């Protein structure tokens, strides 16, 4: 199992540096270079730079004055530092591997690390419930508050997916961010069947797991 | 279109 | 470097046809071009590498053709599991570079939201704020005017909305309309109400609750 494992995502403030790790499995880093790519809103998808298998590193031409790719072979890791971020920094970093070992064909991504270029500061959300009361129930979660993005939501451990609807976030007219998360049951399943909204602001290390039942 | 970083997705 | 021009911008189909995307280099790149396939919150997907060449794990019904500056890659029986964005890459020429991508739009008949009603929490209140929510499920197409009104006044400025993107199983949005009031002006007003127009519903839907009912 090939597999490219990213650090997480979080805030930059402008004009600092940005670091992130990628761990990969499967292959070695003896083998196979590992490429970076970013994805913004202003230049779309955009190739970063690459760490060959024997250490060489090549860099795009706008990048090669504040990139730096380096590698630990045997912790299997890849780090990526940039220098001097401004706003239109704000992107999702990759890491990715290509099918052979010279090629640029990219079969593998990591995750993706969403990377924030803002002065303001980390807070995570407060949640609130989205309490029911034709057969049919909704119920949610109102997670408020919050910065930077993401969140990441999950309804009973995973279990529960179907009918799950998690709205993308909107950006309040404070600088702060709040989504819903939203799920469809059987409202006769309301009174046995415990629904919890699981919510993990990785910014912020702020976790909450909220019960939403019907109100008094 | 413009991508978004929310959603992955291209807004339009 | 090389420019990819991909057309048209946003490809709107019915389930079951066969579709065709479109990249053009700005100079020719024989077949040195790769496809990617993104979904919601997903990373790029490899679909087709050198123009034509298949990849372990991709149905059978993606194929690419092209050599030269004109690039295809083809859906030859689309699925709402294809709803995502569609990008090229060229690496003929150093630096490698993608195309802006190809949004994938699925047609399906109408279909009517379901209409639901959320007060705020008492655990929000103490904070000095309400958020009221309103919830649009499943529905088609895309558009849907939702107004708020609290003792029958026309809320205008207080209120935001997320849609989701198509959902990757029947092709229907969902939409959260969120109305944000001070306690104070929350505790002021009885009757909370979210009333819903769209194409799918021959006269508007309302749904509301009463403060402290």
């Known amino acids: 199992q090939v597999q490219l494992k990213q650090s997480g995502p979080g805030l930059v403030q402008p004009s600092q540096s940005l670091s992130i790790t990628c761990t990969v499995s499967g292959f070695s880093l003896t083998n196979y270079g590992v490429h970076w790519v970013r994805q913004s809103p202003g230049k779309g998808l955009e190739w970063l730079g690459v760490?060959?298998?024997?250490?060489?590193?090549d860099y795009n031409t706008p990048f090669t004055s504040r990139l730096s790719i380096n590698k630990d072979n045997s912790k299997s890791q890849v780090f990526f530092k940039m220098n001097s971020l401004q706003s239109n920094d704000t992107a999702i970093y990759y890491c990715?591997?290509?099918?052979?070992?010279?090629?640029?064909?990219?079969?593998?991504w990591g995750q993706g690390t969403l990377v924030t270029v803002s002065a303001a500061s980390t807070k995570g959300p407060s949640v609130f419930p989205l309490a029911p009361s034709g057969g049919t129930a909704a119920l949610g979660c109102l997670v408020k508050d919050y910065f930077p993005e993401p969140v990441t939501v999950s309804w009973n451990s995973g279990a529960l997916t179907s009918g799950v609807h998690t709205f993308p976030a909107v950006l309040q007219s404070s600088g702060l961010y709040s989504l819903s998360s939203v799920v469809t049951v059987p409202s006769s399943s309301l009174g046995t069947q415990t629904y919890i909204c699981n919510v993990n602001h990785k910014p912020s290390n702020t976790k909450v797991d909220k019960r939403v039942e019907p109100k008094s | 279109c413009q991508f978004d970083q929310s959603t992955r997705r291209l807004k339009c | 470097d090389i420019l990819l021009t991909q057309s048209p911008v946003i490809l709107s189909v019915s389930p079951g046809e066969r579709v065709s995307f479109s990249c053009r280099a700005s100079?020719?790149?024989?077949?040195?071009i790769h496809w990617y396939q993104q979904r919601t919150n997903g990373s790029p997907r490899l679909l087709i590498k050198?123009?034509?060449e298949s990849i372990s794990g991709i149905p059978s019904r993606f194929s690419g053709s092209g050599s030269g500056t004109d690039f295809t890659l083809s859906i030859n029986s689309v699925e709402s599991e294809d709803i995502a964005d569609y990008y090229c890459?060229?690496?003929?020429?150093?630096?490698?570079?993608f195309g802006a991508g190809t949004k994938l739009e699925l047609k399906r008949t109408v279909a009517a939201p379901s209409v639901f009603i959320f007060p705020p929490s008492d655990e929000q209140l103490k904070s000095g704020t309400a958020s009221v929510v309103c919830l649009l499920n499943n529905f088609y197409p895309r558009e849907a005017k939702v107004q708020w009104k609290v003792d029958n006044a026309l809320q205008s400025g207080n209120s935001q909305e997320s849609v989701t993107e198509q959902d990757s199983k029947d092709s229907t949005y969902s939409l959260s309309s969120t109305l944000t009031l001070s306690k104070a002006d929350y505790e002021k007003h009885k009757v909370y109400a979210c009333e819903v127009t769209h194409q799918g519903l021959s006269s508007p839907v309302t749904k509301s609750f009463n403060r402290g009912a």
């Open positions: 050198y123009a034509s």
């Open positions: 760490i060959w298998s024997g250490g060489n590193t």
């Open positions: 100079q020719s790149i024989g077949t040195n």
């Open positions: 990715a591997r290509a099918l052979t070992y010279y090629d640029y064909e990219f079969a593998y």
């Open positions: 890459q060229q690496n003929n020429n150093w630096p490698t570079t």
